[PDB]
Structure formats: C-alpha cells, structure tokens
Amino acid sequence: SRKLILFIVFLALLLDNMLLTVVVPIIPSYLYSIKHEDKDLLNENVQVGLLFASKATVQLITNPFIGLLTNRIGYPIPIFAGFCIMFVSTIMFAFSSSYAFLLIARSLQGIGSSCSSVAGMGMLASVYTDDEERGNVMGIALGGLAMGVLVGPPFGSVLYEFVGKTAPFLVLAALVLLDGAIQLFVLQPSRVQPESQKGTPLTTLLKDPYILIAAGSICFANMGIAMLEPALPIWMMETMCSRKWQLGVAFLPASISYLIGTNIFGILAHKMGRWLCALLGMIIVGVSILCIPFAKNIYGLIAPNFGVGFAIGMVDSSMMPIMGYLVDLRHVSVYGSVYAIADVAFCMGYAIGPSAGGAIAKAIGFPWLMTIIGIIDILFAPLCFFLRSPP
Ligand SMILES: COC(=O)[C@H]1[C@H]2C[C@@H]3c4[nH]c5cc(OC)ccc5c4CCN3C[C@H]2C[C@@H](OC(=O)c2cc(OC)c(OC)c(OC)c2)[C@@H]1OC
C-alpha cells in the first residue's frame, strides 16, 4: 500500500495549502465589509496581518513538540489528529464570523498543518525503500504543496463571490473529511515508527552560516508573497474597486509562474549555476515586487505577479538542492533535514511578513511596504554569492 500512503499525504498537503490560502481573498474582504459597513483600514491592516501570521507562528512553535510526539507514538496517530483538527478549523472558518474565532481557526489550522506536514512526509519517506523512488514520490507530494497553493486562491475567490463565505470552506471540509475517512478505513493494517537514524539537530544545523544564508534567502523570497497575500486584496479594494471574484484571479499568475519556474529551472539550475540562478531569482523578485504597486488595472497586475512567481520558482529550485548539498557536506544528513530547514524558513517568512508588513501598511502605506521588501530582496541578492562551491 505504498501508493495509497503517497495519495493520502499528497491530498493532506494540497488541502493544507488550499485552506491556508483560500483565506486570502475572502477573509480580509469579509472583515473589511463587516467593520466599514481611513483609521478603520489602518487598524484592520494590523489586525488581519496578525490573523494571517498566527498560522505560521503557531506552526513554528508546535513543530518540535509534534516531531517529538511522532517519534514517541508513531506516524499514523499524528496524521489522523492533523486531519481532525484541520477539519475542525475548516468548519469554524465556515461558520464563525467574529475575529476571535477566525484567529482560533487560524491557530488550529497551523497546528494541523504542522501535524500533517511533518508526520505525513516522514511516514511517506519511511514507507518507501528505493532512494530514487523516495525522491520521486517526495517530488510528487511537495509538488502537491504547490498545486494546492495554486488551485486554492481562484477557486476560493470565485465561489465566495458567487455563492457565499460558507460554501468554499464547506467544500474544503468535505475533502478533508474524505481524506481522513480513507486514511482511517483503508490504511488500517499497521503503524509506522520513524527511523532511528537522526541527523544533526536543527539548532546547530541552522547555526551554519551557509545554511543560514540559504534559509534566509528562501525566507525573504517567500516573505515577498507573504506580505503580498494579506494586503493585496485590500489594496485592490481601496484602489481599483474590483469585484470580489478577481482577488483570486490576480493571485493565479503568481502560482502558475511558480509552477512554470520550478519545472524549468529544476533542469536549468545545474547548468546555469545554482548560486547564479538564486541571485537572479532574488533580483527578479525584487524588481517584480517594486513593479506591483504601479498597476492601475489587474491586466497591469498579471505581469508583476508573473515575475514574482517565476523568481520564487527559481529561488526554490536553486536553494533546495543547495540546502541538501550543504547539509550533506558540513553535517550528517537524514532525508527529513532539508525539508525541516525549509519549513522553518517558510514559517519565519509567514511569521514576519503579514505581522510586520501590515503595521508598515498602517504607518507608511502599501506601495512603500512593497518598496521596502523589494529593496530588501535586491540587496540580499548579492549575499547569494557565498554559494560558490567548486562543483
Ligand atoms: C505557506 O506555504 C505556501 O504557501 C506554499 C507556497 C509558498 C509561495 C507562495 N505562496 C503563495 C500564495 C498565493 O496566494 C496567497 C499565491 C502565490 C504564492 C506562492 C508562490 C511562491 N511559493 C509557492 C508555494 C511553495 C510551497 O512550498 C513548496 O512548494 C515546497 C517544495 C519543496 O520541494 C519541491 C520543498 O522541499 C524543499 C518544500 O519544503 C518546505 C516546500 C509553500 O508551502 C510551504
């Protein structure tokens, strides 16, 4: 039943990102409508920034605890717990309306995300035996992480606009319940205990300056989109008075470009130079983030989002193998390590992006927020030169 576990983990990760991102086009607009119907927007910026960063904050906080828990008790129980609490979070998103319950839903979704991510990928890694097959199947589930983040925004936005706020979350609860049911019913026979081969702890592993540089580059490149995601709908609603179904169609190009850039540069990086590809990715994401605020129409927004997605797809494809090579070279390696580092990096971005950027959006505004983050990416691009390994 190796394939079935792969399907379960793929669906878990896809639903996780879909729930993570469907919040982007409907909930900031929901709070805007519920409070206005501007100092109102000034307070709402920081409120929604904290609401969006709570998921990553709680996930980063609870990741080591859940890792210890799955080491002690096994993989399947954390996976099922993650499915159950993700379904709870989806339902509470669907029905609750006040900001406190939305915050609780976001925190519960973060805990469930940590559960599903770490327990699933670990169990998926342990079930398979062939190294090539392991790499291929992890490439499938990690690709699902991206397919979910792609399909989520437009679907959530359009259904919210047409039917209502309760329907997309109801559908998400339906899929999450189906995945939990299939895992519980047709994947009974045995429990998988994680491997006894433990790599370097994340403390010293992140203490490495080179791994720190790569993780910081990933963190900033994704913090770009992490600051885009909770403030771009508000910027559109206060600038172009766009319909509520376009708030997902505008984020569609970023994810499509991420897919395209990943597929292209996962083959082009080892020939164009991984460090050079990462540096160009940082530069391009900086330029695109600068170009985003100067758009008057969504037609003028499809291009900068395309550049943003293309750059991240390039940075990720140029750093994941770089992270693996650095870990294998300067430390002892277990297949989880790389992912773990990336996870922390991602968390950091989404723990500092919306929480702080929104405050900036309240103090200096949105265009300036984007100018600062783009300049940060541009000036961090030269730091990728310290990835000049001889091969
Ligand atoms: C919280 O996370 C995410 O939201 C996912 C995305 C992060 C970011 C993003 N967000 C958006 C949100 C939008 O609307 C709001 C619109 C566009 C985007 C884009 C384009 C840029 N990018 C796309 C998504 C990337 C996903 O992560 C991986 O794909 C991945 C792949 C791996 O191997 C192939 C890994 O192993 C090393 C790995 O380790 C952790 C992670 C990441 O999941 C962690």
Tokens of 309: 């997605």
User: Domain containing 73 — which CATH number?
Assistant: 1.20.1250.20
Domain identity same for 174 and 217: no
Coil, strand, or helix at residue 130?
coil
Domain identity same for 176 and 297: no
CA of 37 to the centre of ligand 1 (A): 34
**Any residues with CB less than 8 A from the CB of 351 and at least 6 apart, and which?**
53, 56, 57, 60
d(CA 235, CA 304): 15
DSSP letter, residue 250: T
- Of 190, 225, 244, the residue that ends a domain is 190
Domain identity same for 108 and 57: yes
In the chain the first and final C-alpha atoms are separated, in Å, by 39
- Supply the range of the domain harboring residue 372: 198-391
Q: Which amino acid is at 368?
A: W
Coil, strand, or helix at residue 335?
coil
Domain identity same for 73 and 216: no
Residue 313 Cα: closest atom of ligand 1:
21
Domain identity same for 102 and 61: yes
- Of 164, 190, 216, the residue that ends a domain is 190
d(CA 32, CA 74): 43
Coil, strand, or helix at residue 330?
helix
Q: Where are the alpha helices (DSSP H) in the chain?
A: 2-36, 39-73, 76-95, 99-114, 120-127, 131-162, 166-186, 202-207, 209-239, 246-249, 252-272, 274-291, 302-330, 336-363, 366-380
Domain identity same for 170 and 294: no
Tokens of 204: 């010293």
CA of 309 to the centre of ligand 1 (A): 10
Q: What is the CA radius of gyration of the chain?
A: 20
* Placement of tokens 């000034």 in the chain: 42
- Of 190, 224, 257, the residue that ends a domain is 190
Tokens of 252: 């569609």
Q: How was this structure determined?
A: cryo-EM
Domain identity same for 122 and 258: no
* Placement of tokens 């160009």 in the chain: 280
d(CA 263, CA 338): 20
d(CA 264, CA 312): 12
Domain identity same for 180 and 239: no
- Cβ 31 vs Cβ 44: under 8 Å: yes
Domain identity same for 155 and 57: yes
CA of 146 to the centre of ligand 1 (A): 6
Given resolution (angstroms): 3.5
Residue 56 Cα: closest atom of ligand 1:
1
Ligand 1 residue neighbourhood (C-beta within 6 Å): 17, 20-21, 24, 142, 145-146, 149, 153, 222, 225, 229, 251, 254-255, 258, 309, 312, 320, 338-339, 342-343, 346, 350
- What domain count does the chain have? 2
Domain identity same for 19 and 57: yes
DSSP letter, residue 117: I
Domain identity same for 174 and 208: no
Domain identity same for 130 and 216: no
Pocket test for ligand 1, best of 149, 252, 350 (most atoms within 8 A of CB): 149
Tokens of 101: 């319950």
Question: How many C-beta atoms surround the C-beta of residue 217 within 10 A?
Answer: 26
Q: Take atom 23 of ligand 1 and give the residue whose Cα is closest.
A: 146
Tokens of 346: 């991602």
- Cβ 384 vs Cβ 296: under 8 Å: no
